[PDB]
Design a protein around this ligand. Structure first.
Ligand SMILES: C[C@@H]1CC(=O)Nc2cccc(-c3cnn(C(C)(C)C)c3)c2N1
Length: 114
């Protein structure tokens, strides 16, 4: 079952754009995590596979998803990392939860049509 990269990009990009459109909630997820800059030096001790919106976008732009479930899994990896690393009072944790609510609504019909 083949998916062309340009085909995946057409179907999935709007679902990623939906996440970028969320303010304030997408701001902490827009760039790769830099632990030293952010003052979280144990981040890579805890989060073994960091993921962020810019990376997911670069993967779509450069044809690095073979099939669309891998994209969904990257988005969820980004959420799961934030729910693992942060406490429940943190903005980052609560913002993650909002992004996951938005993503589910967008991704559902797109995955059904694929
Ligand atoms: C997702 C990432 C890593 C994480 O899980 N927790 C985290 C902790 C502190 C700041 C951040 C954080 C990242 N960017 N920001 C900005 C305030 C937008 C610069 C804060 C943060 N977010």
């Amino acid at each position: 079952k083949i998916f062309k990269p340009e085909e995946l990009r057409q179907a999935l990009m709007p679902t990623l754009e939906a996440l970028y459109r969320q303010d304030p909630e997408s701001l902490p997820f827009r760039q790769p995590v830099d632990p030293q800059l952010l003052g979280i030096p144990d981040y890579f001790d805890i989060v073994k596979n960091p993921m962020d919106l810019s990376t997911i976008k670069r993967k779509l732009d450069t044809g690095q998803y073979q099939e669309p479930w891998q994209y969904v899994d990257d988005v969820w990896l980004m959420f799961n990392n934030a729910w693992l690393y942060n406490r429940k009072t943190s903005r980052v944790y609560k913002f993650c939860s909002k992004l996951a609510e938005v993503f589910e609504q967008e991704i559902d019909p797109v995955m059904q049509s694929l």
